[PDB]
Amino acid sequence: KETAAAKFERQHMDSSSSNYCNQMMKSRNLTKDRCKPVNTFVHESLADVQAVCSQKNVACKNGQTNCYQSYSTMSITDCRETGSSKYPNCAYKTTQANKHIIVACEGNPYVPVHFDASV
Amino acid sequence: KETAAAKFERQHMDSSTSSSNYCNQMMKSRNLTKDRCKPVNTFVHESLADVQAVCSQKNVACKNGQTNCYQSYSTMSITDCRETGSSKYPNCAYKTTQANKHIIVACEGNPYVPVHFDASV
Ligand SMILES: Cn1cc([C@@H]2O[C@H](CO)[C@@H](O)[C@H]2O)c(=O)[nH]c1=O
Known about the structure:
The structure is a homodimer. By secondary structure, the first copy, chain A, is α+β, with helices and mostly antiparallel strands. The first copy, chain A, has a single domain, classed as CATH 3.10.130.10. In chain A, about 20% of the residues lie in helices and about 35% in strands. Chain A has helices spanning about 5-10, 20-25, 45-50, and strands at about 40, 55-60, 65-70, 75-80, 90-100, 100-105, 110-119. A 4-stranded antiparallel sheet of chain A has the order 2-3-6-7. In chain A, a hairpin with a 4-residue loop joins strand 6 and strand 7. Chain A is globular and about 40 Å long. The interface of A and B includes residues 14, 15, 23 and 26 of A. The structure holds the ligand Cn1cc([C@@H]2O[C@H](CO)[C@@H](O)[C@H]2O)c(=O)[nH]c1=O. The ligand Cn1cc([C@@H]2O[C@H](CO)[C@@H](O)[C@H]2O)c(=O)[nH]c1=O binds near residues 11, 41 and 120 of chain B. Ligand 8IZ binds near residues 117 and 119 of chain B. Chain A: Its EC number is 4.6.1.18. Chain A: This is Ribonuclease pancreatic.
């Protein structure tokens, strides 16, 4: 099966338009069987995002203790399904932002396996 | 010089659209039979932006051992061109086969774009 680390890269990494989310959510298989309603893409190097696993330790939403917040803000894009969107014509609003990210980290190598939030 | 990116587009991109004679016409018109019959060549029938986006998708080892290859998460419409046994330069002859497959490309540069077609899977 796809590893959690690889799923994180597919869902959330774009090291790198109003139609950005429409193209990306499709290209990442996030519209295949249903429209994933909410998603964030991070526009930093893979190395910079993996380094978050060595930064500020914080609680995960689910109560676990292996979450980490980036010290620095990062360039991200929030994709959120519009009010009119109906599968299979998934439609998204693209919003660019610079924010801290919070990821859960696991494994060897110790890397992000889940996107918890942006703050 | 032709840039590596422009060369990838000439050799491997055909968004415009494949007949039984598609490869014979296309390998000739894209100058892939100029100095020899190029033995294997793939044309991708997706938008340039969709193919360019593969440089941020699944990182996989290249056939030559370099680490800068990327596999598309979704399948893409492609046409494979393979030289026939009867083919004799300069009258290069090809078998045309359509498929829907994940593509693997090598990417380089700033911007980070496709410069080589490695394989389909
Ligand atoms: C296996 N294969 C190979 C090729 C071409 O052959 C060269 C071999 O060095 C590559 O650089 C490609 O230009 C292709 O287009 N499609 C494909 O599936």
